[PDB]
Design a protein around this ligand. Structure first.
Ligand SMILES: *[C@@H]1O[C@H](CO)[C@@H](O)[C@H](O)[C@H]1NC(C)=O
Lengths: 408, 395
């Protein structure tokens, strides 16, 4: 309707075909379109409508910052930020939010430092962060009775922060970190030290490029097979591996990968009235000139978070004043920013990625366990953060020995 | 006399509160240069990229047009120098030590009067050699200034046959890194962080007993002299506990003021600059000569380029001319001979100090160019000699 006022949202993401990460932005847009379509058809925000404006960050610090500045200068009066995919771009935007009283919701930035509420107070994310693997690993360790672990960490912020977070997760839990090892560019010296300390269960935190070097050092040190269990990040690209390949594969056999779960396994009706499976089919039908994105469900639920936040932000008997305050917004109103921040903090619904709820701006979600089995990563379990429960899939997880390895 | 505007950021608080003395140093220099007209439009960055982002928007999206941007902190300078290409703007920093800022591909319009932090590294290596250490540990806070300094240190230690046997990093809480250094039995430790984080580190150092005869800490020397004595709500450690944890540590800093009693382009001696700056007044006091010289460097580059009213953010023409003048800068400032090379090595000396009985004492100076370690014989150690880098007796 012409009389239907907009509730403007600043969409920031890589979209261009010129950048590799443009595929993420383009890949989530069908999910975003489906959420917007249904919210409008339902007139959930009546008499208003959700006005999502898109700005290309091009996954670049300079272009992302100017896209944000140009959105402020020349775009409509945005009430919140939706997006931030590339960690460095997301950080630049997220730390500056307070200057414009803007609440931000990301569906793809997983780096741990964004959990810092002193630095990023106005930042929220629907996607479980890199630190979210730690409470899941704790449950996995308890499950297989592994009470002694060693750590191998690449001396880079995103990895050292996950490792530092681990100490706090394991405290009061009866799990010993018998050996802590760190490396910059060569893990071999650190792998040799772990072998020398008789570490059997290894918790790794390093990038995709370093993973091949780590497994090559494990191969050279014979730190693989029935006596060892490597637990590393599960967010690497599919077939990231493709040392001689056969020797690398021997060392990699049975490693456990840990990452977020893209979509809920539960066949329950979500807030949209659709099950995660029905949503997945609708998503694959809507997308046309784009490959699927693993963050699509997080983007979809992200639009629902914005809609529910806005609905809550308008729930007052001081209706005309609240509507006037929204209409008047020009980045200077601390009160409206606070109303929106508090409304988002109250989020609690069942989404396509599972129960959507925040703990200090961080998603309480689902973590997926995979195991490397003959050049394929097989899903072996799920950990639910809200319930703090681990479900291991029957007849999936396998061990090279007659029994799982002993921690000593 | 057309007005020409400098968009500047000064850190009055935060990681490095350099603006406290660098802003008056800039104001003193502008008066001297003026007597076109060079005008200053400034904001307090609080050494914070989040806060600087708001001020950068105000500088770029509001009239008057600015010919140059002048940031302080490495984090703020990294943000403004990365972004500046979008507005074809020259960036000139007076306080940024980040080795990563030497990357011309990433920072194509950037200049600095502050040398690169890489200059601390040959001095650290010279002292490791002097004291016979081949095993070192590192602890860093994760700002790029520190990470890129450690990347350079790794190369210099490797070259000297010295190994970094343990590394730890933290974003804000050093509790786990410090506990791990203690459990690893690390002895010689290089700590790279701002003063604020140094207090958090040393309170953990006290609690873990990671101080005493066996332990040698190497820190950055540009903290305030009383840094460990300052009240901090984020630390439980008392002043006396902090004072004991920091005892005997070594610091390195770069000599930024000419030690010779000569008169520069401004016609001042290093000594008169100090009285003049004191007349105006503190964080950034040691860096103040670089701020003073940054204005002179800009003034001389603007003189050579001399169509300034016609500068626009969509035009490369004026940017390229100013860049070329800055690139060919060569004059005598209060900080010595000012020039602008990519890897930031115009300074030849470092000053080495040791904390003795709660007070810093000069112990020497090092010139990496000529390989000259000037030693005062003023260093003190429990038992009369420095400790070992590890146990050596397990046959
Ligand atoms: C945010 O939500 C949590 C969880 O329900 C609550 O404990 C906390 O008080 C909230 N913060 C506010 C209202 O500022």
């Amino acid at each position: 309707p012409p009389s239907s006022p907009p509730l403007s949202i600043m969409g920031l993401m890589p979209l261009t075909k010129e950048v590799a990460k443009g595929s993420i932005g383009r890949g989530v847009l069908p999910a975003v379109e489906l959420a917007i379509e249904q919210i409008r058809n339902e007139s959930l925000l009546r008499p208003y409508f959700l006005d999502l404006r898109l700005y290309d960050t091009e996954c670049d610090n300079a272009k992302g910052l100017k896209a944000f500045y140009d959105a402020i200068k020349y775009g409509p009066n945005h009430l919140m930020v939706f997006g931030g995919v590339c960690p460095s771009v997301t950080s630049i935007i997220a730390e500056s939010l307070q200057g414009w009283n803007l609440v931000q919701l990301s569906f793809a930035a997983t780096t741990p430092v964004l959990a810092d509420k002193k630095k990023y107070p106005y930042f929220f994310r629907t996607v479980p962060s890199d630190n979210a693997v730690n409470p899941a690993i704790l449950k996995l360790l308890k499950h297989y009775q592994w009470k002694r672990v060693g750590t191998l960490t690449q001396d880079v912020q995103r990895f050292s922060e996950v490792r530092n977070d681990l100490t706090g997760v394991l405290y009061g839990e009866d799990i010993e970190i018998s050996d802590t090892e760190s490396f910059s560019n060569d893990p071999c010296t650190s792998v040799k030290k772990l072998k020398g300390n008789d570490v059997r269960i290894i918790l790794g935190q390093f990038d995709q490029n370093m993973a091949a070097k780590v497994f090559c050092c494990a191969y050279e040190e014979n730190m693989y097979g029935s006596k060892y269990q490597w637990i590393i990040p599960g967010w690497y690209e599919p077939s990231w591996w493709e040392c001689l390949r056969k020797n690398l594969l021997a060392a990699m056999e049975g490693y456990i990968g840990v990452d977020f779960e893209p979509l809920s396994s539960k066949q329950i009706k979500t807030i949209s009235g659709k099950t995660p499976q029905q949503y997945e089919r609708e998503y694959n039908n809507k997308r046309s000139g784009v490959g699927p994105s693993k963050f699509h469900g997080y983007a979809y639920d992200g639009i629902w978070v914005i809609a529910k936040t806005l609905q809550r932000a308008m729930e007052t008997l001081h209706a005309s004043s609240r509507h006037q305050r929204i209409q008047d917004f020009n980045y200077t109103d601390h009160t409206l920013g606070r109303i929106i921040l508090n409304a988002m903090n109250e989020t609690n619904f069942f989404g396509v990625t599972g129960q959507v709820v925040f703990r200090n701006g961080e998603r309480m979600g689902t973590i997926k366990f995979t195991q490397f089995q003959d050049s394929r990563e097989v899903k072996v379990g799920e950990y639910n953060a809200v319930a703090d429960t681990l479900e291991i899939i029957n007849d999936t997880i396998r061990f090279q020995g007659s029994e799982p390895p002993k921690d000593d | 006399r057309r007005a020409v505007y400098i968009g500047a950021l000064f850190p009055m608080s935060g990681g490095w509160p350099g603006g406290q003395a660098c802003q008056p140093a800039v104001e003193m220099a502008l008066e001297d240069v003026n007597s076109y007209e060079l005008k200053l439009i400034h904001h307090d960055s609080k050494c914070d990229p989040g806060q600087a982002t708001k001020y950068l928007y105000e500088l770029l999206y509001n009239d008057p047009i600015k010919i140059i941007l002048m940031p302080g902190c490495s984090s703020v300078s990294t943000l403004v120098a990365e972004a500046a290409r979008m507005w074809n703007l020259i960036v000139l920093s007076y306080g940024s030590s980040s080795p990563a800022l030497s990357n011309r591909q990433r920072f194509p319009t950037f200049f600095r009067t502050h040398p690169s932090a890489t200059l601390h590294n040959p001095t650290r290596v010279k002292l490791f050699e002097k004291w016979g250490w081949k095993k070192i540990a590192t602890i860093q806070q994760t700002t790029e200034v520190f990470t890129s300094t450690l990347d350079d240190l790794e190369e210099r230690v490797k070259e000297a046959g010295i190994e970094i046997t343990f590394r730890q990093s933290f974003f804000s809480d050093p509790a786990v890194p410090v506990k791990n250094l203690k459990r690893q039995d690390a002895r010689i430790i290089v700590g790279l962080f701002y003063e604020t984080e140094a207090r958090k580190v040393f309170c953990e150092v006290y609690k873990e007993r990671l101080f005493g005869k066996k332990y040698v800490w190497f820190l950055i020397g540009w903290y305030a002299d009383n840094w460990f004595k300052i009240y901090d709500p984020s630390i439980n450690c008392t002043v006396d506990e902090m004072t004991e944890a920091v005892e005997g540590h070594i610091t390195t800093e770069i000599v930024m003021l000419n030690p010779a009693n000569t008169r520069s382009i401004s016609n001042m001696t290093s000594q008169e600059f100090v009285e003049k700056l004191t007349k105006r007044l503190t964080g950034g006091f040691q860096e103040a000569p670089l701020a003073y010289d940054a204005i002179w460097a800009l003034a001389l580059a603007l003189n050579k380029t001399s169509r300034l009213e016609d500068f626009n953010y969509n035009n490369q023409t004026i940017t390229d001319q100013i860049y070329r003048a800055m690139n060919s800068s060569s004059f005598e400032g209060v900080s010595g001979h000012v020039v602008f090379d990519a890897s930031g090595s115009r300074m030849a000396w470092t000053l080495i100090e040791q904390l003795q009985g709660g007070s810093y004492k000069k112990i020497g100076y090092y010139d990496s160019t000529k390989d000259d370690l000037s030693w005062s014989k003023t260093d003190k150690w429990i038992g009369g000699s420095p400790p070992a880098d590890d146990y050596k007796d397990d046959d």
